[PDB]
Amino acid sequence: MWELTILHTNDVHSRLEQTSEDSSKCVDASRCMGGVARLFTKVQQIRRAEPNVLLLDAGDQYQGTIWFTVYKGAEVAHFMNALRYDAMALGNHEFDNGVEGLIEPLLKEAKFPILSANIKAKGPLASQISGLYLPYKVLPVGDEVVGIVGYTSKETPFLSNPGTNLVFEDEITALQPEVDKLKTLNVNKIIALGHSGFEMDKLIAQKVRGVDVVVGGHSNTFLYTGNPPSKEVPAGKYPFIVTSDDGRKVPVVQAYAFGKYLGYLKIEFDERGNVISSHGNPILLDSSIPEDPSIKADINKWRIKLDDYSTQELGKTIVYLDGSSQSCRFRECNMGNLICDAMINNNLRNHVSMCILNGGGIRSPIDERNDGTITWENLAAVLPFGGTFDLVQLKGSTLKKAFEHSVHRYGQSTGEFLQVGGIHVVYDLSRKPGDRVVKLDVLCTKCRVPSYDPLKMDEVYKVILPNFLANGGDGFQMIKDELLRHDSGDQDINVVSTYISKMKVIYPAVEGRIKFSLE
Amino acid sequence: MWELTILHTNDVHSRLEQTSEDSSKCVDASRCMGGVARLFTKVQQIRRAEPNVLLLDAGDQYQGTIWFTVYKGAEVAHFMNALRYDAMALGNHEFDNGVEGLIEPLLKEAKFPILSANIKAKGPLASQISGLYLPYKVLPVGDEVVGIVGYTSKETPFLSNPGTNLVFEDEITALQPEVDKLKTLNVNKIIALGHSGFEMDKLIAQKVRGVDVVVGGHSNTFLYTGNPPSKEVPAGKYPFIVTSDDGRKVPVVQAYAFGKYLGYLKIEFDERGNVISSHGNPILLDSSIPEDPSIKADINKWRIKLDDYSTQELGKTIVYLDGSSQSCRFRECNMGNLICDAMINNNLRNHVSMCILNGGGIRSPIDERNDGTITWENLAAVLPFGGTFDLVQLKGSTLKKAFEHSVHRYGQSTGEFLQVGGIHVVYDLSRKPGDRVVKLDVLCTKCRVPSYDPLKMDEVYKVILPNFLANGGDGFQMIKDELLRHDSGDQDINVVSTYISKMKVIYPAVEGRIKFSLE
């Protein structure tokens, strides 16, 4: 009878410091959460208590706050090394600054194995990257060994910039022979640690023979057993049990995002590495857990370089700028309207009138209680990808297809839900996918007084949108394929910063741009 | 058989210069209309042709452009004297600068009789004002005499600032004994010239025994016989015939507004002053009629003082700013939304969120074709009254009553139709007056993310509105009576000027703030 305690994080997205409850900047310290100094305190407390502990990360440490914009991964290596992570799997945002932005800051500086079994490197890169990441690592834990097999989303080429020299194979196809290899080496306890989403995690648990546990990320899945401690609503019980094809009960875990919770699963293994049982729950890293003074002091040393991005007040908001995924991927959110209003206002500085913006590109809210202040830092967490707001010419039929795409698989917190400007769209979700747009009115351009008229399929419209959408991101293949004209635009954060400075005080509202009908 | 040609103007509202087709500033001179130099040319041409001519004005020369803001009536006297008007009746806007603003600039300087039979002066004013205006004037016309009896809206106390020392009697009650007096003096041809609206004009024609003709104003009524020459749609035939209670066919005339048309009625009288017949039509004063070089040259001399209000460009519009009555008293107009958006933006510079604005207070459009320029002059014609945008606290029931008032007598081009900000109102005109508001949603204040929720009768709301409305103007007695708090605000034009300067380029749209339902 051998008990293993798995501590896990995922999709931390540069939340090195403690944050507000919604993962935005900490203002009121007495009610802040997460951060690596607080995470250190709980991890310490568990290592003291439990003899067999593994601290794992399921990817997406990269991208999210001014920390990454400035340290570009050097902070991830340093603070993950200080927390003494046992292993990390590569996520899609680890490739946002290319392979050289992964290699030099993180891979060459981590003191723990970084893992991906379905990433194969070819051409000139094959020689460089060899050994910097591994398909698995066999880790000594007490008197035993635990094998950890990594995996990264098959669709990382479409989500990031891994380059042409890396091949992302199907997770299951790539994992099975590595799991078999570990078994032939008598590694009888195997953890699949990776970054492909809860749905793939469940499939791996079902299909990859020999995997005892799956620790995932990518879908920001919150699982819980009992009454939850904060605003996140559970998608299922923690752990989520999958019965594999060979009949084993396989626990599947995920721990939301932003370092708000520490995943915690206790596994009771028998002497042959069979899972007899498991139990646990994500630990909310709230104000009650003190921040470790040593990590805190070191965070404060690294925080000095970032304070030049917090001194200049760009403007002021008198409203909560709702950039949460719970809003922005499900309904009209005022952060969306603000961003689309800045996009449109910038383009005129000629006239285009319409704006579409993927809800998933809104990576954070902004709080109004700090005397309403808005800084470059506040904005860098909302728009971290360094994209541009481009002008495009589209047929009405193309736009109808994009709005059908916006809600084709509604209800799953997917980033393709569009925020708009100069568009009044009505959806009926009782209708079949591809036929849910019941009204779509657009602001006229060939008119002296602008007003809303129904969209015409045979007409052409000028639309300002992120380059991510113009390139067919979030499955908007129809935009990239069918567009008639594409012009590169201005940097996304500079556009919003410029608008907020011109306005001085902002108060964007939810005003009926996107509605749902269920008569 | 004696023929009289009556030339008449009304509601000229300081359009001393020629204007665009919509009565806004002239930009493209080749298609401009009206103005006193062009009016002089047609009046001249008719005086040459016809031996018996009277040039009459039915009031409201005062208020409308930078001309009045600066010359305060001195320009009205000078250019009416140069046009050689035979008589003018007092309108309600002649009292906008009090009785001293009427007396000194216009009354003491006009070389023609200024008339009002239903205005009686009491107290200290009675001595001052005696003889400066008259109830009637008997005018020699060729070998005959024509009597002209004046009248001014009974409701001028509620519309302007005539003061407590002037009494406005019922028009019919005051006119009858003056008409009888003229008959006893064997004045057998009588014109009623006044400023009370087409509906009162028709009543006077019906009820005042001995009136041969009624020449009115105040309702900007356009009458025409045949196919009309411009965008104004006729309210009836020109002249409009009323059969009086004693059985006479009495012609009633009006000539729209802004000096765009010159009223023209030929009356065939018999030797006892009976009207045998009449005919005519308003003459459109378009580009084809040349501007008189002498009046034009004199207009250009007086235009130098006003050019300091045209040099500074406040901002720019890329949309036609529809401030027409045809829009703003009938539906959501983008000039209304712009003005309400400036009102709301100014008040925050705390937060209130809602705005109501009487459509009649929007006194002109602004054109975008002049490279989109907006000047103090452009704005002074939209907002000429020198009012303030005040903060008020109202019960929801009060606001419901105001929106019911907005459309209680819809379809008559009345100024009480409200333009809004932070309100989504739906009207159903098939319903009975006092019950046409089918939806009224308002932008929440006690919420972190503003959104539209139905108005509650028992709740209280903060509303920015013109002081004209806070004082119960346009019959909004419920606002003045029921309001819980009233704070004096900032000057109306300075508020809009400030907003346009902050925005640099404006593009207000018609966006569904006010809708009509007829399912």
Ligand SMILES: O=P(O)(O)CP(=O)(O)OC[C@H]1O[C@@H](n2cnc3c(NCc4ccccc4)ncnc32)[C@H](O)[C@@H]1O
């Ligand atoms: O993204 P996670 O893995 O954390 C999974 P999530 O569910 O929290 O968020 C998914 C959503 O984020 C959005 N997203 C993601 N990366 C985006 C991007 N650039 C990336 C990038 C490309 C190349 C070079 C550098 C940088 N630009 C715009 N939207 C993006 C997109 O809307 C997607 O549906």
Ligand SMILES: O=P(O)(O)CP(=O)(O)OC[C@H]1O[C@@H](n2cnc3c(NCc4ccccc4)ncnc32)[C@H](O)[C@@H]1O
């Ligand atoms: O007004 P006309 O006689 O030309 C008749 P119209 O049909 O063209 O316009 C009528 C509409 O104009 C509007 N109006 C009129 N005078 C207004 C005002 N101040 C006046 C004033 C009071 C006291 C001291 C100085 C100045 N403030 C605001 N709206 C006003 C009102 O909405 C009304 O229904």
Ligand SMILES: [Ca+2]
């Ligand atoms: Ca096992």
Ligand SMILES: [Ca+2]
């Ligand atoms: Ca007569």
Ligand SMILES: [Zn+2]
């Ligand atoms: Zn992520």
Ligand SMILES: [Zn+2]
């Ligand atoms: Zn991811």
Ligand SMILES: [Zn+2]
């Ligand atoms: Zn008038």
Ligand SMILES: [Zn+2]
């Ligand atoms: Zn009037």
